[PDB]
Structure formats: structure tokens, C-alpha cells
Amino acid sequence: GKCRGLRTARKLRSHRRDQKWHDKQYKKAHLGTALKANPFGGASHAKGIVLEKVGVEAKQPNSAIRKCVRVQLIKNGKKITAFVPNDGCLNFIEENDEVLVAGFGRKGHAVGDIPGVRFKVVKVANVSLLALYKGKKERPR
Amino acid sequence: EWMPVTKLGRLVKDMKIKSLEEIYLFSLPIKESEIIDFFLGASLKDEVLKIMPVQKQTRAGQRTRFKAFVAIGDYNGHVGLGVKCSKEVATAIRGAIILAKLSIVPVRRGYWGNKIGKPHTVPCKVTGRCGSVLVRLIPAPRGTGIVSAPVPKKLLMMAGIDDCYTSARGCTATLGNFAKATFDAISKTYSYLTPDLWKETVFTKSPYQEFTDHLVKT
Amino acid sequence: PVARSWVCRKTYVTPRRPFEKSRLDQELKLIGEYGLRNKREVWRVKFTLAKIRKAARELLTLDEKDPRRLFEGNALLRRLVRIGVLDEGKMKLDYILGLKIEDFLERRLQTQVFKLGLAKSIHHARVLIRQRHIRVRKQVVNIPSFIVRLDSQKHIDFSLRSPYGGGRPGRVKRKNAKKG
Amino acid sequence: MQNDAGEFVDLYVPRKCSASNRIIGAKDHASIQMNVAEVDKVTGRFNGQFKTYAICGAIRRMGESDDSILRLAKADGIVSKN
Amino acid sequence: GDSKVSISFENYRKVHPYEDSDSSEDEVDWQDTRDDPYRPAKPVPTPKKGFIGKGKDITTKHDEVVCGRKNTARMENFAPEFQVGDGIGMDLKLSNHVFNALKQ
RNA sequence: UUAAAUCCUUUAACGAGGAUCCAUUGGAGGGCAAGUCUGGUGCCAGCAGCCGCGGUAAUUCCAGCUCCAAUAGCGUAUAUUAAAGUUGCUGCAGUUAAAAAGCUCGUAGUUGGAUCU
Numbered sequence: 001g002k003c004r005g006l007r008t009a010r011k012l013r014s015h016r017r018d019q020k021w022h023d024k025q026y027k028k029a030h031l032g033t034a035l036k037a038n039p040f041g042g043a044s045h046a047k048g049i050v051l052e053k054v055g056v057e058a059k060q061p062n063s064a065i066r067k068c069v070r071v072q073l074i075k076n077g078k079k080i081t082a083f084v085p086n087d088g089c090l091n092f093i094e095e096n097d098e099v100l101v102a103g104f105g106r107k108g109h110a111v112g113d114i115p116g117v118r119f120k121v122v123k124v125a126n127v128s129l130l131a132l133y134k135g136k137k138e139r140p141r
Numbered sequence: 142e143w144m145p146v147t148k149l150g151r152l153v154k155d156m157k158i159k160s161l162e163e164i165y166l167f168s169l170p171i172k173e174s175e176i177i178d179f180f181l182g183a184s185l186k187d188e189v190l191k192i193m194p195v196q197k198q199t200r201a202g203q204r205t206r207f208k209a210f211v212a213i214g215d216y217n218g219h220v221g222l223g224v225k226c227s228k229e230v231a232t233a234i235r236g237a238i239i240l241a242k243l244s245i246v247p248v249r250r251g252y253w254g255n256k257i258g259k260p261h262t263v264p265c266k267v268t269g270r271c272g273s274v275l276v277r278l279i280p281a282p283r284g285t286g287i288v289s290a291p292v293p294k295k296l297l298m299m300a301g302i303d304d305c306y307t308s309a310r311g312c313t314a315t316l317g318n319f320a321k322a323t324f325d326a327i328s329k330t331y332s333y334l335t336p337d338l339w340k341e342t343v344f345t346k347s348p349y350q351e352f353t354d355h356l357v358k359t
Numbered sequence: 360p361v362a363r364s365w366v367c368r369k370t371y372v373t374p375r376r377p378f379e380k381s382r383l384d385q386e387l388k389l390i391g392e393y394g395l396r397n398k399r400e401v402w403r404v405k406f407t408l409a410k411i412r413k414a415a416r417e418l419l420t421l422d423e424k425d426p427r428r429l430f431e432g433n434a435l436l437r438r439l440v441r442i443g444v445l446d447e448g449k450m451k452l453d454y455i456l457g458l459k460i461e462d463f464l465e466r467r468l469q470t471q472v473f474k475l476g477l478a479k480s481i482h483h484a485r486v487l488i489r490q491r492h493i494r495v496r497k498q499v500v501n502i503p504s505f506i507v508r509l510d511s512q513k514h515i516d517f518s519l520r521s522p523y524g525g526g527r528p529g530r531v532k533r534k535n536a537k538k539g
Numbered sequence: 540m541q542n543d544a545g546e547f548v549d550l551y552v553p554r555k556c557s558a559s560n561r562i563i564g565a566k567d568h569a570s571i572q573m574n575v576a577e578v579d580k581v582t583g584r585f586n587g588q589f590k591t592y593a594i595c596g597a598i599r600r601m602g603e604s605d606d607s608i609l610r611l612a613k614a615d616g617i618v619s620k621n
Numbered sequence: 622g623d624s625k626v627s628i629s630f631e632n633y634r635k636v637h638p639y640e641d642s643d644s645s646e647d648e649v650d651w652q653d654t655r656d657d658p659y660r661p662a663k664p665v666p667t668p669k670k671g672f673i674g675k676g677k678d679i680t681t682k683h684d685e686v687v688c689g690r691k692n693t694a695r696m697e698n699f700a701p702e703f704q705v706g707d708g709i710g711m712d713l714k715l716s717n718h719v720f721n722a723l724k725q
Numbered sequence: 726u727u728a729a730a731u732c733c734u735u736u737a738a739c740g741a742g743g744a745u746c747c748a749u750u751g752g753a754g755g756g757c758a759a760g761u762c763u764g765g766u767g768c769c770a771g772c773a774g775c776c777g778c779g780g781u782a783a784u785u786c787c788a789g790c791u792c793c794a795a796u797a798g799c800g801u802a803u804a805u806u807a808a809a810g811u812u813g814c815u816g817c818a819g820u821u822a823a824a825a826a827g828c829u830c831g832u833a834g835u836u837g838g839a840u841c842u
Contacts, residue, residue, distance in 0.1 A: 044803035063768045102802045162551040165565045231706020256542040284456030332564045337540035344591035378758045380683045388681040391672040
């Protein structure tokens with residue numbers, strides 16, 4: 001069992017330190033290779049330039065063609081497939097426009113129906129998609 | 142109309158047994174729901190903890206019947222927990238109450254600190270261990286209420302426990318086994334021994350004994 | 360550096376369980392019974408009572424002969440009595456644990472002006488408090504969360520400048536009387 | 540069980556097993572209570588009075604009830620020495 | 622109680638001149654009247670302030686008894702393969718923790 | 726008021742019918758309070774944090790109506806904390822679910838029979 005002496009503190013804490021790495025969450029947060037491989041670079045939102053639009057096929061049970069947009073991040077030049085959130089919102093987005101992109105909400109997991117997309121477009125040309133969808137804004141170019 | 146089959150039910154039918162506590166002193170089996178219905182009256186409040194459905198796999202196919210976990214409780218008194226399977230739901234519920242009154246147990250109410258007034262909490266931290274579910278009941282000071290999951294919260298409102306701490310272990314998501322575990326703990330209140338009950342007991346007669354002359358006539 | 364104070368306290372706690380019918384029922388019943396604007400007034404009163412009870416409970420773990428046990432015990436008793444909740448016969452530290460939420464909402468200026476009947480209805484009472492027509496002693500109070508003391512309860516008036524008070528009739532009356 | 544004022548704040552006092560002083564529970568339905576008779580020491584006549592033994596369910600289950608009754612009857616002298 | 626081969630206690634019956642006494646012949650008719658529980662409540666429009674009444678007898682919005690009866694009535698509009706029982710004849714206060722599981 | 730202004734506090738006059746001097750943000754399968762309401766699309770568009778809905782009556786889309794929650798605030802993403810007794814000193818596990826080295830010796834380490842008022 002567990003060592004239960006009174007002069008055994010360094011063994012207990014060294015054992016704890018070595019066994020904290022096998023926790024994948026603590027290793028992901030503290031070893032920090034997922035922090036460098038993150039396209040956002042530990043950022044809540046990123047800003048890119050639209051490169052093309054791709055219709056990606058969904059999972060096998062739910063058949064749909066989700067209209068993702070391939071953008072190039074201004075920061076480090078990584079290619080991002082970001083899902084345009086709502087229906088009819090693919091119409092507003094246009095090639096070579098400055099775009100603000102956020103994740104879906106599983107902290108780095110392809111959420112649900114779409115393999116390879118864990119990002120969603122929030123803003124285009126410094127106006128939101130929610131304003132354009134609800135008839136609140138006029139899009140500049 | 143209430144019809145007696147036990148001799149205990151015959152004694153309860155007349156005014157020979159004053160309260161429910163002559164049964165519990167002697168651990169006599171309460172085999173009729175309507176004994177419990179007689180002694181407590183309308184004080185027994187209850188709400189169904191869950192109706193979980195199990196589809197019975199049969200020779201013809203799959204046809205479902207429903208299992209009712211109901212919790213009946215006399216406040217600052219007694220609790221019972223009933224589990225009943227039936228074709229309907231309301232039939233399963235009524236079977237669950239009539240089965241839960243058979244499972245009425247008295248819980249012990251004690252004190253945390255100094256002993257002033259009516260008892261309020263579990264007298265000593267007990268445990269209920271049912272099918273990988275482990276419910277610990279810890280005494281608590283006045284007015285803190287019961288800190289627990291909703292279903293043991295229900296059973297501890299019904300127990301008359303005003304305030305206690307609760308710890309759970311295992312798969313809690315099985316509601317029925319969780320409720321059976323905490324029910325086992327509040328039964329283990331009298332299954333536990335305290336230094337208060339260290340005096341040598343004096344043995345009274347079992348209700349069958351001094352009242353057998355009336356059972357000769359029946 | 361600046362000559363400023365950044366001491367600020369959140370005076371309410373959001374409940375952990377967001378949608379349960381029991382909590383929503385008790386909160387809405389209490390709101391309707393003493394006429395509050397939203398749930399945050401209930402949550403504020405709940406948090407104040409929780410702090411008082413937790414202080415009392417953290418006092419009870421000390422010895423009976425502990426000096427600060429006695430000192431802040433007497434202080435807590437005196438404050439809870441002068442605010443108008445406890446009574447002089449109930450000066451014991453364990454009786455604060457026998458307090459509930461509405462015992463703190465009965466001392467609001469809204470409920471006090473309703474119970475003393477100087478206004479008509481409890482929503483009318485809240486309106487009359489915020490509409491600047493009701494004063495305490497000599498100071499005009501326009502805030503319905505004003506927790507009225509026991510000794511200051513016995514004199515609440517109509518704020519003499521008000522039309523319900525001494526005089527100076529309002530805008531609507533002076534417009535109506537200058538019609539013809 | 541009893542507050543500082545002195546009132547017996549308890550629902551009832553449960554009986555204890557005579558063999559091992561354990562509290563016999565409410566739903567311990569395997570427990571027993573012997574009434575055992577003693578005799579007049581001159582003629583072997585029933586007196587009408589009786590001694591009492593209570594045994595919990597576990598003692599009866601493991602097979603130790605009869606030896607417990609025998610040794611408590613030796614203690615009470617209802618069964619003779621040796 | 623229900624057996625075909627049955628016993629008759631006729632010889633132990635002592636006296637029965639007038640068997641059809643008017644004590645067991647009570648005419649129980651409550652269907653077409655307004656005393657049957659199996660009748661709609663004629664629902665009131667939803668209050669905006671969220672409660673009915675004032676003082677101590679303020680009947681609130683959900684009001685667990687009322688909400689339980691409402692959830693029972695919402696069970697009454699389930700799938701035909703579902704079996705309910707007699708949930709209106711016996712006062713069934715069923716909660717959302719249970720009703721939502723049954724609805725699922 | 727103030728260095729002089731501002732803002733707050735005080736005073737005169739004007740200033741109030743909701744069809745306003747008009748309150749938003751999310752949601753209504755479960756988790757989780759709220760609809761088996763109506764019309765359209767028809768595994769398309771989409772919703773969807775999880776399970777899943779949509780393949781011609783959609784309890785989940787799109788609109789409208791109604792309802793709920795919080796309310797001058799309310800969603801969203803990220804990071805982190807509690808729930809986590811899923812890092813375990815308190816306090817986890819190791820036959821079969823992840824797991825005890827093939828076995829033995831052995832240094833450092835860790836712990837070490839009674840016994841003296």
C-alpha cells in the first residue's frame with residue numbers, strides 16, 4: 001500500500017509529481033505541446049483571411065453538407081476550416097475578407113456532425129454574422 | 142372495511158396496542174399496509190421518487206412494465222420506501238405505496254452539540270451500503286438544513302431529519318439503489334448502538350403474551 | 360498610483376441549481392408576498408442571512424467561556440434586536456439559527472409602510488417610497504430596501520412638501536384646476 | 540436520548556440481545572424471545588413467573604443461539620451446574 | 622373471492638325477512654353531473670405577474686400540487702402504446718423529474 | 726459644487742395613456758423552467774455543448790402565435806477553479822474492467838520487539 005511514515009514526505013510528493021503527468025488533462029495544460037500546436041496560440045478568438053469555401057460532408061447517421069470556410073490565420077499562417085453558424089449565412093461571406101473565428105465549445109474537439117471542424121465564424125469585415133442575419137447591419141467591402 | 146388476518150392485526154383492530162412502538166420494540170412483522178394506515182392516519186405524505194420503465198423481453202416480443210420507487214413518510218416520525226413493477230403506471234404507484242407502508246422503519250433523531258430542546262439531526266454519522274452505492278450521513282449543527290442530493294433530500298425531509306451532511310460514492314445515477322442505500326442508513330440509526338443505550342434492558346411481555354386471553358376468543 | 364479605494368463586494372449569490380420548481384416557487388411566492396422587483400432582492404436577503412447564520416455557527420464551535428465568542432455574540436444579538444428581528448426574551452446565540460428569510464424582509468420600508476398602512480397597497484407602497492412622498496423622522500427616504508429600525512419605526516410620515524402631507528398640490532391637480 | 544432539561548427525548552428504547560449486548564433492530568425479524576419457566580424447589584411446580592432471553596438474528600443464523608441460551612441458563616441456574 | 626367452486630354460508634344466516642333494505646341500494650350517479658373528477662378545468666388565462674392572490678394564501682405559478690396535476694393531465698396525452706392507470710381518480714402529484722423521464 | 730468648470734444635492738416653470746416617454750437577451754425532447762399550437766422545407770436547408778430531430782403530421786429546422794428564465798442586463802468563445810474520492814496525506818485503485826517487475830540478493834531511502842517510577 002501507500003507509505004505511511006513520518007520522514008517520508010519527499011517520497012510522497014515525488015510520487016505525486018511523477019504520477020500527475022499520467023493525468024492527460026494536467027499534462028495537456030502543463031507540458032504545453034498542445035499550447036504550441038494550437039492554431040489560436042492560446043487565444044479565445046483569431047483573425048484570418050478567407051481563402052475558399054468548402055462543403056464538407058457530415059457524419060454517417062446525420063446526412064448533411066455543412067458549408068465550412070477555409071481561412072488563413074494572420075498570426076501564424078495556419079489553415080482553418082471554420083463552420084459558418086446559421087442557414088443563409090454563407091451568402092454574406094465572400095472571398096478575401098477579414099474574418100473573426102471562434103471555437104464551438106469543447107475546448108479542442110470536433111463537435112458532433114462535422115469531422116475536422118472545431119471552429120465557427122463570428123465576424124466578417126468587423127461586423128457580426130448575427131447582425132447581418134437579423135437585418136441589423138450593412139456589410140462594407 | 143379493514144379485515145384482519147394476523148393476530149397482530151386483530152390486536153391493532155381493537156384498542157389493545159396503544160401505538161406503533163410496541164411492534165418496533167419487539168420487531169414484529171407488519172404484514173398489513175392498513176395497520177400503518179390505522180396508526181398514523183393522514184400524516185403519511187408521499188411523492189413518487191421515480192417511475193423507471195423496463196421493457197420485459199417476452200416470447201411474443203418486447204412489452205414494457207413500469208417500476209415505481211415511491212417514498213412514504215411521516216414527518217418527525219417514520220419513513221418507508223416502496224418498489225413495485227406493474228403493467229400500468231398508476232397501478233404500479235399504488236402497489237408501491239401499499240408495499241412501502243409495509244417497510245416503515247423508525248429513524249433516530251439526535252443532537253450535534255449541546256442537548257437543548259427537540260432532536261434535530263442524525264445522532265452519529267452512519268453509512269448505507271447498497272450495490273456499489275455508499276451514502277454517509279454526518280451530524281450537523283442547527284439550522285444548516287440537509288446538504289444532499291435531491292432524492293436523499295426527499296427521504297431526509299420525510300425522516301424528520303432537519304439538518305445533516307451527506308456523502309455519496311459509486312454510481313449515484315441509479316436512483317433506486319441510491320435511495321435504498323440512504324434508507325438503509327436511516328434504518329441503521331437504530332441498528333447502531335450509542336452509550337446512551339448502555340443501561341441493561343428490562344424485558345416486557347411480547348404483545349402476544351399478556352393478550353393471549355383475547356386471542357382465545359378469536 | 361491613485362488616491363482611490365477598490366473595495367467592492369458582491370452582495371448576492373446565484374443559486375447552484377438554476378431551474379428547480381421548488382426554489383422558483385418559494386422565490387416567486389416570496390416576491391409576490393412582499394412585492395420585490397426581481398429575484399436579486401431575494402438573493403441579496405438570502406446572502407445576508409447566510410452570512411449572519413454562518414458567523415453564528417462559526418461562533419458556536421468556540422467554548423462557552425471564550426472571550427470573543429461572548430463579545431461578537433452580544434454584538435450580533437444587539438444588532439439583530441435593534442434592526443427589529445429578534446426580541447429581548449430571545450437573547451441567545453442559538454436563536455439566530457431559528458431565523459428565516461421573511462423575518463428579514465418584514466423590516467423593509469415597503470413592508471413597514473404597508474403594515475403601518477400609510478399607503479394603500481404594497482405595490483402602491485413601493486411606488487410611494489420611490490416617488491419621494493414618505494420620510495423617516497425628518498429624512499426623506501426614496502429607497503424601498505431601507506431596513507427600518509425598531510425604535511425609528513414609530514414615526515414615519517408623509518414628507519410635508521408632498522400633497523398627501525402638508526400641501527403643495529401636484530402637477531395634475533394644478534393643471535386640472537387651471538382648466539376653467 | 541435525554542436532553543439537559545431531563546426529558547426522555549427518544550421514540551422508544553430498543554431491547555438488547557442477551558448473548559452479546561447488540562441492539563435488536565426494528566426489522567430484525569429473525570430475533571427470538573424465550574420465556575423460560577422456573578420451578579418450586581420442593582415439588583417441581585410451575586410458579587407462573589418466568590425469566591426472559593432475547594437473541595438477535597445473526598446469533599441464530601451462525602448457529603450459536605442454543606449454546607448462548609445454555610450458558611445464560613447456567614448463569615441463571617435454571618440448568619444445573621456441569 | 623372469485624373462485625368457481627365456491628362455498629355458501631346460507632345455513633349460518635339467521636334472520637332475513639326484508640333482504641332489499643334501503644341501505645345498500647344507494648344510487649351512485651356522478652358521471653353526467655359536475656362532480657366527476659374526469660372533466661376539464663376550463664383553464665384560466667396565464668397571469669402576467671406570476672401568481673394568484675396575496676398575503677399568505679398566494680397561489681404561485683408552478684405551485685407543486687397544481688403542477689403535479691398538470692403533469693398528470695399532460696401524461697393523459699401520451700402515445701396509445703403507453704399505459705397510465707387511474708391517475709385522475711387518485712390524486713397523483715407527479716413531478717418533472719419523473720414525468721420528464723416517462724415522457725422521454 | 727469646484728482652482729474655474731462638470732456631476733450629485735436644493736428651487737421656479739414646462740413635462741404621462743399606454744395605440745407610450747413603448748426592455749432586451751436567450752430558449753420551449755431530455756439534461757433544465759417552458760408548446761405534443763399553426764403554416765412552409767422535406768436526412769436538402771438546417772438544429773444539435775451530450776444523446777439525437779429533419780428521408781411528406783418535424784415534441785428539436787425555418788417563420789408566426791403563445792410560454793419560460795434572467796432582467797438594464799443577457800448570450801458566445803477561451804482559460805481556470807469546485808463538483809474530482811477521475812491525482813486520492815486526509816482519501817482511489819492493481820484476479821476477471823487500465824494495472825504486481827520472471828525470480829532472488831542488495832546499497833541509499835522508509836519503517837523497526839519487550840524493557841528503567
